[PDB]
Scaffold this active site. Structure first.
Site, PDB file in Angstrom:
ATOM      1  CB  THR I   1      -0.945   0.010   1.210  1.00 37.04           C
ATOM      2  OG1 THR I   1      -1.911  -1.020   1.010  1.00 37.04           O
ATOM      3  CG2 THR I   1      -1.670   1.327   1.394  1.00 37.04           C
ATOM      4  CB  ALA I  49      -8.093  -4.310   4.017  1.00 38.78           C
TER       5      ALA I  49
HETATM    6 CL   LIG Z   1       0.715  -1.120   4.248  1.00 39.41          CL
END
Ligand SMILES: [Cl-]
Ligand SMILES: *[C@@H]1CC(=O)N(CC)C1=O
Ligand SMILES: [Cl-]
Ligand SMILES: [Cl-]
Ligand SMILES: [Cl-]
Ligand SMILES: [Cl-]
Ligand SMILES: [Cl-]
Ligand SMILES: [Cl-]
Ligand SMILES: [Cl-]
Ligand SMILES: [Cl-]
Ligand SMILES: [Cl-]
Ligand SMILES: [Cl-]
Ligand SMILES: [Cl-]
Ligand SMILES: [Cl-]
Ligand SMILES: [Cl-]
Ligand SMILES: [Cl-]
Ligand SMILES: [Cl-]
Ligand SMILES: [K+]
Ligand SMILES: [Mg+2]
Ligand SMILES: [Mg+2]
Lengths: 213, 204, 240, 238, 214, 225, 225, 228, 200
Positions: I1, I49
């Site tokens: 990410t 998440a």
């Molecule tokens: Cl991450």
């Protein structure tokens, strides 16, 4: 030292069409190097227009589906209507997260119709992270299924190809093919393939034979 | 070792009609000295003192929580506490924490508030009391202190002799302990007066 | 002003009126009888038909509280049903702890002490029901106990509760029950119910019959329909 | 049971609290108790209601309680209730000292106890405490102080006040004689005898405690019978 | 149970035309020690349902107590409703999963056999709450030694008679006696049909040891 | 613990305990509040000689930007004030902003309302006038009463003879009266002089934009009289 | 003497009876449901010109698609309004959809009758009109202290509800537009009100399939009058 | 007077007035009718603005009609729904109707014996289908319950009961259409002579051998009224 | 990410990749990592998440309740404080969250970093995730407060892109949002493969 989890295998797949959704799974239930049964479907009907596939720890699959069935009725009683595909997906997210510190060892895919009659697929991690998908493979052979779907359904890495809508006929042939291929390589996938087709007419099922080894 | 984290040493010593109590002045965290004037001896009456060695946080907590209970006792009973009763009150406080103890092992020194008879004791961290007629020691240099006290102590010492004995015992003991010292304070308790002295001491 | 509002209040003459008032609720109920014979216990109930709309079998006044224990009730039926649950739970718990079937006398004593607990406090009211417990085994033989709203418990050869109790006892006393079998007793029970039934005041009733004995192998059961009908016919023709 | 509940914590149709008012009636029948603030200290003067000949007198006081190092109090009303409350005052004072490592300021001690008394008037369905208290003390904020609390949990500061029997007559005498800002302890003593003389004279029948500062330390002392007998003689001359 | 003590080995089950048959030996092992050689590991639940248990024998006795009382409770009502085999299996799944989720499992694997509404029932429940139905079941070493033989016959002939299913079970019990070091040559066979539940025993298998001269 | 239902409905839909609580308010000393242009003023009637004036005050700061006056049971008031003071700190902690005058009013009101519908408790026997400024510098005046109803006012009075003072303020609360800070204070004194028959037995406090509560001296009040 | 959970010989809960009487002490509120939306109108009932009219809030937003008019003991309603707001947000969180007007009304009415012997000592002395738009179209619901709720085409609550309801039954038709409904309720409020209706002494709000809950501004009220 | 305020107070005549008063609450409710054949169980209800709901879904095999305090009705309906969910969760099969009714009686008896508590001021007609066929039960504030061939509760229900007794000999053999009409006719007896059953005031619930409990309202009740 | 955000003259830019992994397996290339709390508040997803989605959805719930109760929109400071207080109770229980709360309130553009470790800090620029170090490099070299709107877009887009190049756990598409005074807008969504064509 007691372990509360075991891996029971299984592969699940869902594809969203223009006016249909497909949920498919194999029928094998495994433990270690053994087969429990050759006739254990991983798909469960929730409403007339929603089916859920569940793989992972079979103990948790059984418990969770019974919890969902109860929650559907509870919702129908207090809201005076059946739950939408989207509402089921959202609710399941919270159910999975309620066990954040002792998770359901479960990979879930919801397939059905949205409120416009269009195909909807939702995929979940064990603690309820989720999103809407065009297509999704889950469980034992998902790393085997997913790349071909990306290629054939998503048209990934293909030049000079028209991005045609996905017909039910082509979708059905793709589902059968990926499972037959998975049954070649993943020791957990085999016996039979169960396909659920969700349209406005209702849910119809088809079963195809797979390798027994 | 949890008891050696802050270091420290305290001892009490019995004379003829008087008692003495002494403590090092170092507050440190492992190797690092932080201050050189840390209080370890607290008054619990006109002629009764408690000294606490061990974990600095627990030294302070036990001092404060004991004063709480003693203040209430004195208001209720309308008299000063006898030394043996303070020992019992301390034992009770420490044993309440049997399964999660305070890391402090106190010594008590005082005169009976009516008979002026000398009293010294020490307790372990879970409040087992020990009354002696000579001396008590507590801290990270207990062995050094035992060696000095066994050699120097005599019965029926006058206030001046008692002062020299506890001074020499403390100075020479803490000078063999890396995490004790940075000064020594001494209280001589007599019927008619308290004498408080700080000694010239090594500051390493 | 009144000394009759709370079970935690004695009257000046040492009575507990709330218990007495609860007993009146039993006295207003229709009659149930139990008879202990040679090889078991038989129960019969005059079950008043309040409406023709009700099913034949509605508002049972005979209960199984264990496999070997029957219960016959008179009074406020909701209170009786809850006491049946108490008794069931007591029998169940006994087996779990001690590993055998609860003796009838012990069950009677235990349920009676529960009943009694409701006679002490302003926080709760006494049960408005009396009941009979009946059992049979080879070791213990036939046993019949009766408990009232105060929590008193005694064993009987024959017993009646409800509005025609005194009239029922008169008839029961005429039997040498000790020498008779359950087959003979069911007929006599049917008879006595038909005798004490006030045909002018209360119009329609169903006869309810159960038994426990050697013939049922120590299991409390409803009297078979065919035997029940024979007893009804015998009772009807006897009343000629 | 709703039948037996006397409902001690409800309003009357006039917005009155009857139990509180009946409690204040009880206090008006208790021994006279007054306090006087001066420039160099505070004092409490109490009527002993234990004046029987066969009594032993085992304590240093009967109606005057030390609360902490810097504070004392006296009480009018139910004796047993006063014992509960004074114990609680000692606890609050010690709880504050534990937490802050300084003595509790006088008003903070009064407020804390009054909160307990107020609670008894609003919930719990219990009878209130039938006690009025006079508090004397010194703190670093306001120096010498005198407070009064009553059963409802109201309090106020005073330069001079009286609770108990004939307190209305006492408060009248105080208004006349109290020289605001000009009172010493010796003249306050005199005024106390003078007030107790009218509202009630013997040394066995009174109890006087003084609170002063000596060498940056509070001294609370109950006057000996000899000092009180000399103060009674000094008045009768006037 | 954190640590199983006295334990039982394999339980077998096979559906036949008109009923179900289960089998279990009569041994409680204490580690490798064959300690209690005359215990029953099969339970009649009601007239339509039977149950066999591998694993901790104390935990089995507890389930017998609980489930036995449950059936008594239901019969007291006399309301014409009775727990089906499928209902018992469901209850058992919930109980095992519940105990697993408390990190305090009942240390058992179980086979439920039943006959109701002209339908054979055969169900599996393990200590983690894994449950399923199958035409044949075998727990423990039975899973490796008996189940292959069971499934082999059912492949060529899905519908067995009662005598065929009985012969097949006896053959599997012989194999387990030969190859499972925690087995014992003393077993029970329980059958459920329209007529109810019968428990036969103690039974023995004849053995052949000719290969000892080979 | 004690669970008796103390506040209950009577025939006609009356909550008698709340109405009796409102009677306790009327036995209280008069309190007046006026919202000016850039100032808010509170004034209270006082009941004596030999008493310490500092200890018995009917005007109290809840936060740096909020203060209140009360009429009724003084013990009940102390409880409500300290509850509100705690809540002002909890708000600064959680939102990192000072409380709005409306927020703390809403809190006080809902506390009072709860004591009209909770077992084992009688209602609070006080009304409150709550004043201060918001973030955008808007002056505010709210009133709460025992029932837990609250409203904003331009000017208001509570306690003994509140009805007379209110009728005075209705005729006197104009732009000319609140044009300056001096005339805003004056209007409060005049309002009080209408029922206090006095001028030396009045306590008064002023609050200006982000300047904190200032209690006026007796010498400064003697100038206005 | 008598408990809060006592039945009368006629089979009615006394406390609930008395709570319904308290609604008659409230100002008049009107709701009309059309195919174009729902409108809510309430009399503010100003008791003093010194009181700020905008601090009287008798129509509140529950969510973007649901409004609520109240009458009776207003302090009691605040806790009911909060329950409704929280419940709509709980439903959104779990199901990622809007909660129906009926479901919200149902959730709020679950609180009623949940009193007895620091839990609730008495019923709530308020009636509510829930007006909003969901997938069933525009909908108006009424709930009273008993916890009974029902869908209404047009409903009036408060002191003058009997007369207002007569007026509503005369003017209402199913094909009636929203603009008509707004005018109708303002005409009815005008005749049942004690004071002369103006733009400051009434509240008006609509919810339409097109747009969110909208509270009418001062200028928007003037246009309608 | 002194015997009628507390559910824990017996009168000298052996009665509890609070329970009797609670039973008056159901008499003030509007009429509802329940009847059964050998295959179906039917509920019919008169609804007293929209007409107030009277028929509630409990499970696929159980539905109820209510008379009395609406709030008590929902409290009891929620309990019933929960019991049904619990049964399916644990046993994977529907809760037998008679077992649910027993659970109701046990639950509603508890407050009749405890100080400061009150009876449930609601009566229920319960329509169900299980292994023992169709069922109609009636529950009372007294916590007593009855197994019925047919029943009616609510205001002027006495005349509905009179109709039912007259015709109950033919109920068992009726098809669904005839059985519903019997229920409608019985309910119509409760109405004043001028007033009639309409699609606005009639609510129908049906459960049977091959039909999950279904509620018919408004336009959905038209086919049933047309045959009359 | 990789996620980033920065305040500037014209508001706050928020950008993210779209890859989710399970071990070395790419589970998704179409994750929405910019979470729409309300029309005036954005949050970002990094770490777990489920943890980010759940807790920020809970924040959205609390913020809406606040708006209804107070009749005013919540500030960025207060929203970020709510989230910090929520997760603090769970320290050491294995929550994985790194988020940026981005909005525009009475104090102007607002940007807070909040994590499951208990950190809550206001700042001009942030980058969070496995790829954050690579984005910091590019963003730091290009960032200015007086950047123009199109220049801000280009910088955010490029910084994420360069992170996806170096960091195995970042990729898919670059999603870009702009928080303005009257609410946020979705500015663009560009596949990394398309950006490769553009940048070379
Ligand atoms: Cl991450
Ligand atoms: C029996 C129980 C019930 O509710 N009723 C109606 C009043 C009965 O007749
Ligand atoms: Cl302590
Ligand atoms: Cl009797
Ligand atoms: Cl002190
Ligand atoms: Cl102190
Ligand atoms: Cl054995
Ligand atoms: Cl058995
Ligand atoms: Cl509170
Ligand atoms: Cl007032
Ligand atoms: Cl109304
Ligand atoms: Cl109701
Ligand atoms: Cl009844
Ligand atoms: Cl009726
Ligand atoms: Cl994306
Ligand atoms: Cl909030
Ligand atoms: Cl910061
Ligand atoms: K394979
Ligand atoms: Mg040293
Ligand atoms: Mg990469």
């Amino acid at each position: 030292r007691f372990s509360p989890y075991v891996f029971n295998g299984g592969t699940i797949l869902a594809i969203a069409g223009e006016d249909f959704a497909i949920v498919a799974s194999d029928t094998r239930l495994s433990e270690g190097f053994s087969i429990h049964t050759r006739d254990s479907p991983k798909c469960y009907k929730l409403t007339d227009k929603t089916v859920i596939g569940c793989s992972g720890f079979h103990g948790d699959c059984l418990t969770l589906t019974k919890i969902i069935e109860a929650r559907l009725k509870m919702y129908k009683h207090s809201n005076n209507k059946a739950m939408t595909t989207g509402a089921i997906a959202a609710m399941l997210s919270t159910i999975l997260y309620s066990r954040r510190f002792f998770p359901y060892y479960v990979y879930n895919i919801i397939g059905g119709l949205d409120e416009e009659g269009k195909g909807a697929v939702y995929s979940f991690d064990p603690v309820g992270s989720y999103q809407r998908d065009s297509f999704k493979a889950g469980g034992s052979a998902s790393a085997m299924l997913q790349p071909l779907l990306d290629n054939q359904v998503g048209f990934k890495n293909m030049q000079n190809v028209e991005h045609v809508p996905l017909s039910l006929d082509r979708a059905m042939r793709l589902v059968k093919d990926v499972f037959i291929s998975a049954a070649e390589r993943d020791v957990y996938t085999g016996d039979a393939l169960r396909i659920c087709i969700v349209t406005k007419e209702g849910i119809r099922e088809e079963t195809v034979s797979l390798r027994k080894d | 070792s949890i008891m050696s984290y802050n270091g420290g040493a305290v001892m009490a010593m019995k004379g003829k009609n008087c008692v003495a109590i002494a403590a090092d002045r170092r507050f440190g965290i492992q190797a690092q000295m932080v201050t050189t004037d840390f209080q370890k001896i607290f008054p619990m009456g006109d002629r009764l003192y408690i000294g606490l060695a061990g974990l600095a946080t627990d030294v302070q907590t036990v001092a404060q929580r004991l004063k709480f209970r003693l203040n209430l006792y004195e208001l209720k009973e309308g008299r000063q506490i006898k030394p043996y009763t303070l020992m019992s009150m301390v034992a009770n406080l420490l044993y309440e924490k049997r399964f999660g103890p305070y890391y402090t092992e106190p010594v008590i020194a005082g005169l009976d508030p009516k008979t002026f008879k000398p009293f010294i004791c020490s307790l372990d961290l879970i409040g087992c009391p020990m009354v002696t007629d000579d001396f008590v020691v507590s801290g990270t240099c207990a062995e050094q202190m035992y060696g000095m006290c066994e050699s120097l102590w005599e019965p029926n010492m006058d206030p001046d002799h008692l002062f020299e004995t506890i001074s020499q015992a403390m100075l020479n003991a803490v000078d063999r302990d890396a995490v004790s010292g940075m000064g020594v304070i001494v209280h001589i308790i007599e019927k008619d007066k308290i004498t408080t002295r700080t000694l010239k001491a090594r500051m390493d | 002003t009144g000394y009759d509002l709370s079970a935690s209040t004695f009257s000046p003459d040492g009575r507990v009126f709330q218990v007495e008032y609860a007993m009146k609720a039993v006295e207003n109920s229709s009659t149930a009888i139990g008879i202990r014979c040679k090889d078991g216990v038989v129960f019969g109930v005059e079950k008043l038909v309040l409406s023709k709309l009700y099913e034949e079998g509605s508002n049972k006044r005979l209960f199984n509280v264990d496999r070997h224990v029957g219960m016959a009730v008179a009074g406020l039926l909701a209170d009786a049903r809850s006491l049946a649950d108490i008794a069931r739970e007591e029998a169940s718990n006994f087996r779990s702890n001690f590993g055998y079937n609860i003796p009838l006398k012990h069950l009677a004593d235990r349920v009676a002490m529960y009943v009694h607990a409701y006679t002490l406090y302003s926080a709760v009211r006494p049960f408005g029901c009396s009941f009979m417990l009946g059992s049979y085994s080879v070791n213990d033989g036939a046993q019949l106990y009766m408990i009232d709203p105060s929590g008193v418990s005694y064993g009987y050869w024959g017993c009646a509760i409800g509005k025609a109790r005194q009239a029922a006892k008169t008839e029961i006393e005429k039997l040498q029950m000790k020498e008779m079998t359950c087959r003979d007793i069911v007929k006599e029970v049917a008879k006595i119910i038909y005798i004490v039934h006030d045909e002018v005041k209360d119009k329609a009733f169903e006869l309810e019959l159960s038994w426990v004995g050697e013939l049922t192998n120590g299991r409390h059961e409803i009297v078979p329909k065919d035997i029940r009908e024979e007893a009804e016919k015998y009772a009807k023709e006897s009343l000629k | 049971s709703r039948r037996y509940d006397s409902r001690t914590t409800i309003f009357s149709p006039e917005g009155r609290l009857y139990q509180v008012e009946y409690a204040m009636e009880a206090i008006g029948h208790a021994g006279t108790c007054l306090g006087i603030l001066a420039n160099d200290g505070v004092l409490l003067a109490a009527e002993r209601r234990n004046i029987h000949k066969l009594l032993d007198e085992v304590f240093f006081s009967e109606k005057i309680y030390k609360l902490n190092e810097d504070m004392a109090c006296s009480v009018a009303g139910i004796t047993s209730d006063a014992n509960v409350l004074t114990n609680e005052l000692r606890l609050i004072a010690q709880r504050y000292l534990l937490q802050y490592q300084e003595p509790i300021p006088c008003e903070q001690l009064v407020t804390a106890l009054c909160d307990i008394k107020q609670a008894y008037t609003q919930f719990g369905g219990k009878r209130p405490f039938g006690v009025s208290l006079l508090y004397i003390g010194w703190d670093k904020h306001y120096g010498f102080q005198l407070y009064q609390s009553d059963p409802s949990g109201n309090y106020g500061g005073w330069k001079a006040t009286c609770i108990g029997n004939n307190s209305a007559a006492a408060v009248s005498m105080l208004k006349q004689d109290y020289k605001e800002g000009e009172m010493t302890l010796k003249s306050a003593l005199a005024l106390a005898i003078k007030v107790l003389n009218k509202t009630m004279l013997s040394a066995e029948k009174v109890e006087i405690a003084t609170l002063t500062r000596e060498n940056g330390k509070t001294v609370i002392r109950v006057l000996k019978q000899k000092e009180v007998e000399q103060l009674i003689k000094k008045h009768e001359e006037e | 149970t954190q640590n199983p003590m006295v334990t039982g080995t394999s339980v077998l089950g096979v559906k036949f035309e008109g009923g179900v048959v289960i089998a279990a030996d009569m041994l409680g092992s204490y580690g490798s020690l064959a300690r209690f050689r005359n215990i029953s590991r099969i339970m009649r639940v009601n007239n339509s349902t039977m149950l066999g248990a591998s694993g901790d024998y104390a935990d089995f006795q507890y389930l017998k107590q609980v489930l036995g009382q449950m059936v008594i409770d239901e019969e007291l009502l006399g309301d014409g409703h009775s727990y089906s085999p499928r209902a018992i299996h469901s209850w058992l799944t919930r109980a095992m999963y519940s105990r697993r989720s408390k990190m305090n499992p009942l240390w058992n694997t179980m086979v439920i056999g039943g006959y109701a509404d002209g339908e054979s029932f055969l169900g599996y429940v393990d200590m983690l709450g894994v449950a399923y139905e199958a035409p044949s079941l075998a727990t423990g070493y039975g899973a490796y030694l008996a189940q292959p033989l069971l499934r082999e016959v059912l492949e060529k002939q899905p519908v067995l008679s009662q005598t065929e299913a009985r012969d097949l079970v006896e053959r599997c019990m012989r194999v387990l006696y030969y190859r499972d070091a925690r087995s014992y040559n003393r077993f029970q066979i329980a059958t459920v049909t329209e007529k109810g539940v019968e428990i036969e025993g103690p039974l023995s298998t004849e053995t052949n040891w000719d290969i000892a001269h080979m | 613990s004690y669970d008796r239902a103390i506040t209950v409905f009577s025939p006609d839909g009356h909550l008698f305990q709340v109405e009796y609580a409102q009677e306790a308010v009327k036995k209280g000393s008069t309190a007046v509040g006026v919202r000016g242009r850039d100032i808010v003023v509170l004034g209270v009637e006082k009941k004596a000689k030999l008493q310490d004036e500092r200890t018995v005050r009917k005007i109290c700061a809840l936060d740096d930007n909020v203060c209140m006056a009360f009429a009724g049971l003084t013990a009940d008031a102390r409880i409500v004030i300290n509850r509100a003071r705690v809540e002002c700190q909890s708000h600064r902690l959680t939102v990192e902003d000072p409380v709005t005058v409306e927020y703390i009013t809403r809190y006080i009101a809902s506390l009072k309302q709860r004591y009209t519908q909770s077992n084992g408790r009688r209602p609070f026997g006080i009304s409150a006038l709550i004043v201060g400024f918001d973030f955008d510098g808007t002056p505010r005046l709210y009133q709460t009463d025992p029932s837990g109803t609250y409203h904003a006012w331009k000017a208001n009075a509570i306690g003994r003879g509140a009805k007379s003072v209110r009728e005075f303020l209705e005729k006197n609360y104009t732009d000319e009266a609140i044009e300056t800070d001096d005339l805003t204070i004056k209007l409060v004194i005049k309002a009080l002089l209408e029922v206090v028959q006095g001028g030396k037995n009045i306590e008064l406090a002023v609050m200006r934009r982000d300047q904190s509560l200032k209690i006026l001296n007796p010498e400064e009040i003697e100038k206005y009289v | 003497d008598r408990g809060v959970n006592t039945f009368s010989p006629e089979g009615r809960l006394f406390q609930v009876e008395y709570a319904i009487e308290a609604i008659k002490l409230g100002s008049t509120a009107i709701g009309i449901q059309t195919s174009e939306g729902v409108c809510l109108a309430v009399e503010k009932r100003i008791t003093s010109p010194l009181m700020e009219p905008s601090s009287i809030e008798k129509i509140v937003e529950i969510d973007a698609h649901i409004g609520c008019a109240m009458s009776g003991l207003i302090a009691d309603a605040k806790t009911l309004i909060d329950k409704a707001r929280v419940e709509t947000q709980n439903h959104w969180f779990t199901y990622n959809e809007t909660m129906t007007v009926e479901s919200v009304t149902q959730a709020v009415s679950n609180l009623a009758l949940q009193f007895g012997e620091g839990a609730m000592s008495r019923p709530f002395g308020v009636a509510l009109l829930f007006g909003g738009v969901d997938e069933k179209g525009p909908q108006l619901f009424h709930m009273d202290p008993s916890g009974t709720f029902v869908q209404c085409d047009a409903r009036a609550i408060g002191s003058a509800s009997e007369g207002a309801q007569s007026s509503l039954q005369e003017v209402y038709h199913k094909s009636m537009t929203l603009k008509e409904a707004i005018k109708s309720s303002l005409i009815i409020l005008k005749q049942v009100m004690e004071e002369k209706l103006n733009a400051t002494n009434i509240e008006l709000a609509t919810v339409q399939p097109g747009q969110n809950f909208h509270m009418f501004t001062k200028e928007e009220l003037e246009e309608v009058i | 007077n002194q015997y009628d305020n507390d559910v824990t107070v017996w009168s000298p005549q052996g009665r509890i007035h609070q329970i009797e008063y609670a039973m008056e609450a159901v008499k003030q409710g509007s009429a509802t009718v329940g009847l059964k054949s050998k295959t179906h169980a039917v509920l019919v209800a008169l609804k007293r603005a929209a007409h107030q709901k009277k028929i509630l879904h409990v499970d696929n095999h159980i539905g109820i009609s209510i008379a009395g305090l609406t709030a008590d009705a929902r409290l009891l309906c929620n309990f019933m729904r929960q019991e049904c969910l619990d049964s399916r969760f644990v046993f994977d099969r529907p809760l037998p109707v008679s077992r649910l009714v027993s659970l109701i009686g046990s639950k509603t008896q508890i407050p009749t014996q405890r100080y400061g508590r009150r009876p449930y001021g609601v009566g229920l007609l319960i329509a169900g289908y299980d292994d023992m066929g169709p069922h109609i039960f009636q529950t009372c504030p007294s916590a007593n319950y009855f197994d019925c061939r047919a029943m009616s509760i609510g205001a002027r229900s006495q005349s509905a009961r009179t109709y039912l007794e007259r015709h109950m000999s033919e109920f068992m053999e009726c098809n669904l259409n005839e059985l519903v009409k019997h229920g409608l006719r019985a309910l119509r007896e409760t109405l004043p002579a001028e007033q009639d059953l309409t699609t606005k005031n009639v609510s129908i619930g049906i459960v049977g051998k091959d039909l999950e409990f279904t509620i018919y309202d408004d336009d959905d009740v038209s086919p049933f009224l047309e045959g009359l | 990410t990789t996620t980033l955000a920065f305040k500037f003259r014209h508001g706050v830019i928020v950008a993210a990749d779209s890859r989710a992994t399970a071990g070395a397996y790419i589970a998704s290339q179409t994750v929405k990592k910019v979470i729409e709390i309300n029309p005036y508040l954005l949050g970002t997803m990094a770490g777990g998440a489920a943890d980010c989605s759940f807790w920020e959805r809970l924040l959205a719930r609390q913020c809406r309740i606040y708006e209804l109760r107070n009749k005013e929109r919540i500030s960025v400071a207060a929203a970020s404080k709510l989230l910090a207080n929520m997760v603090y109770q769970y320290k050491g229980m294995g929550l994985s969250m790194g988020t940026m709360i981005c909005g525009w309130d009475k104090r102007g553009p607002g940007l807070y970093y909040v994590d499951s470790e208990g950190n809550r800090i206001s700042g001009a620029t942030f980058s969070v995730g496995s790829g954050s170090v690579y984005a910091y490099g590019v963003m730091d070299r290009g960032y200015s407060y007086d950047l123009e709107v199109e220049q801000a877009y280009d910088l955010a887009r490029r910084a994420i892109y360069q992170a996806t190049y170096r960091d195995a756990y970042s990729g898919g598409a670059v999603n870009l949002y702009h928080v303005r005074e009257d609410g946020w807008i979705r500015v663009s969504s560009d596949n990394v493969a398309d950006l490769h064509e553009k940048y070379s």
